[PDB]
Structure 1
Amino acid sequence: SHRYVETMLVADQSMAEFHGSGLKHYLLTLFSVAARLYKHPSIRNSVSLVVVKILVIHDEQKGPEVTSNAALTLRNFCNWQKQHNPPSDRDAEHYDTAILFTRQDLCGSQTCDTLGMADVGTVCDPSRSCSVIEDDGLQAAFTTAHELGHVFNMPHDDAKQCASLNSHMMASMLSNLDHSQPWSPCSAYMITSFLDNGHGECLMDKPQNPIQLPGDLPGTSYDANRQCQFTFGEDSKHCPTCSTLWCTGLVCQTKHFPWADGTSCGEGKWCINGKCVNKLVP
């Protein structure tokens, strides 16, 4: 059976100001990458992330209170998004989940290494189906997949329950993603059970005129200078391939993330899975 995750994307005042007019393309660029990831066969389910609504909070007072407190920010946003969801799924802009994006540096009690936040097993509960994502660059696309995993009842891959079942999207710490198997067996089992138990019944309807997702690779929209800007601010640029984006700040810096797929790395070549390869595949 085919599940469709009708989504409202929301950007706060920090996003509007930082991104200007290009904000909405940026949000859908990030979300198209998430959608691709959920179409990977390793999830062992048929799941279509679709956009039915986008809100930009130009005026802070017209949005939820956003703070460095990542937990309090999720809760603030989860309460706030209820007033903007039409009561019936028959409604066209009715959404099964809501995601907030902020330039704000998210922190837990311990560090500000926090990238994102969601409760576990909330997808068909309109009071609880929410995520907040830190915009630290195109890599936030993967924070978004991760958070939605939690929303789909996925625990981290080092959770005790994942032992006999189990590099993948639901890792508790950042490292090299297996591009041939983005989702672990634990992950597949856990979303599969969640849906089998009946907690994905809201996802069966098809969206009405959903907001169209970019079909091109993200690096086609955004060159390496732009990617450095997204992560390090507008004055940053690409440091004088593909494996690690290094950026100015001659002083250079990196969040140890690859160049986005599609990023030009010479005439006739672009990045694909951290490798500079010919655009005309043999």
Structure 2
Amino acid sequence: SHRYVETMLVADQSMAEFHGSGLKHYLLTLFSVAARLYKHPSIRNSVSLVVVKILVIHDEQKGPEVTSNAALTLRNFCNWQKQHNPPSDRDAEHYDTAILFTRQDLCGSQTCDTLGMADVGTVCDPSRSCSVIEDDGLQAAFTTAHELGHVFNMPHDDAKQCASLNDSHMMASMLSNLDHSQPWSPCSAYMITSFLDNGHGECLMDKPQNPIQLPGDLPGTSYDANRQCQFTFGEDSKHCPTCSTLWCTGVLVCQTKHFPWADGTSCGEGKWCINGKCVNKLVP
């Protein structure tokens, strides 16, 4: 049966300052891509990510302490989100999960290549059902879905428990090329299924009361290549000077993080990017 992941989205002061008025549309744009990934048939389940609440923190002290140490930020965030959840799921703004988004670059013990953070198997535990996402651009939509994967009991696809069943899927242990034709591995598929068959989706059974509408356009529609570049490299960056790799300014100096342009991104009159390819908007 149908599962509804009622979610609170939280943005820290770094996000408020960076994004200004456009902040809530941007989080919703992230979450809508993540919501799509969870509807892909390879998850082999019926999962609906819905937003019941959004908090923006304009003053550090009114939110959790966000530090570059990712494990500690997650823990800070988890503690802090408790107080803002209504007790019973009868309440409309009661959430099953909470996600923090920050511009601060998050770090492990060893490098600052951390992109997000969550514990495994926590989705209906109100005090552990959280994630922190570093916002380095639109690709943070896939970070959002990966970490939500942890929350749903998915291990990384190199875990020994995944040997029997399966680097190119959502739950890769490191950033690599996603297979957009099959986002979730057989392992991810099984580990979420097991979890729900074991009864751990219980708080996901109730439908949301007037959820915050997610954008139904493509992320490239709201955000053109210059915007995309700015989300990654700061407001002074523009598109370089197509689709497969987004290059951005920094002797013309240009830089990339190797991601394609967001789907729906204008690549000329009557054409737009779809899975790394520039194609006519009108399809046959």
Match for residue 79 of structure 2? Answer: 79
Shift of 1:164: 1.3
Shift of 1:174: 1.4
Shift of 1:239: 0.7
CA–CA separation in structure 2 for the residues paired with 1:35 and 1:229: 24
Match for residue 252 of structure 1? Answer: 254
CA–CA separation in structure 1 for the residues paired with 2:180 and 2:279: 16
Shift of 1:245: 0.5
Shift of 1:246: 0.5
Which string of whole-angstrom CA distances, capped at 9 and with x for unpartnered residues, describes residues 80-134 of structure 1?
A: 0000000000000000000000000000101000000000000000000000000
Structure 1 stretches of at least 4 aligned residues deviating more than 3 Å after TM superposition: none
Shift of 1:43: 0.2
CA–CA separation in structure 1 for the residues paired with 2:249 and 2:164: 44
Which string of whole-angstrom CA distances, capped at 9 and with x for unpartnered residues, describes residues 230-265 of structure 1?
A: 000000010120000000011010111110000000
Q: TM-score by structure 1 length?
A: 1.00
Which string of whole-angstrom CA distances, capped at 9 and with x for unpartnered residues, describes residues 150-178 of structure 1?
A: 00000000111101100110001112211
CA–CA separation in structure 2 for the residues paired with 1:200 and 1:160: 24
CA–CA separation in structure 1 for the residues paired with 2:227 and 2:191: 37
Give the aligned CA root-mean-square deviation in angstroms. Answer: 0.4
Shift of 1:197: 0.3
CA–CA separation in structure 2 for the residues paired with 1:28 and 1:45: 23
Q: Secondary structure at the match of 2:144?
A: helix
Q: Secondary structure at the match of 1:180?
A: coil
Q: Secondary structure at the match of 1:191?
A: helix
CA–CA separation in structure 1 for the residues paired with 2:155 and 2:273: 31
Shift of 1:21: 0.2
Shift of 1:180: 1.2
Q: Secondary structure at the match of 1:84?
A: coil
Q: Secondary structure at the match of 1:183?
A: coil
CA–CA separation in structure 2 for the residues paired with 1:198 and 1:117: 24
Shift of 1:179: 1.2
Which string of whole-angstrom CA distances, capped at 9 and with x for unpartnered residues, describes residues 164-219 of structure 1?
A: 10011000111221111100000000000000101110000000000000000000
Q: Secondary structure at the match of 1:87?
A: coil
CA–CA separation in structure 2 for the residues paired with 1:259 and 1:172: 23
CA–CA separation in structure 2 for the residues paired with 1:232 and 1:154: 31
Shift of 1:69: 0.3
Match for residue 211 of structure 1? Answer: 212
Q: Secondary structure at the match of 1:267?
A: coil
Match for residue 126 of structure 2? Answer: 126
Query: What number of residue pairs does the alignment pair up?
Result: 282
CA–CA separation in structure 2 for the residues paired with 1:175 and 1:103: 22
Which string of whole-angstrom CA distances, capped at 9 and with x for unpartnered residues, describes residues 55-84 of structure 1?
A: 000111100000000000000000000000
Q: Secondary structure at the match of 1:199?
A: coil
Match for residue 242 of structure 1? Answer: 243
Q: TM-score by structure 2 length?
A: 0.99
CA–CA separation in structure 2 for the residues paired with 1:276 and 1:85: 43
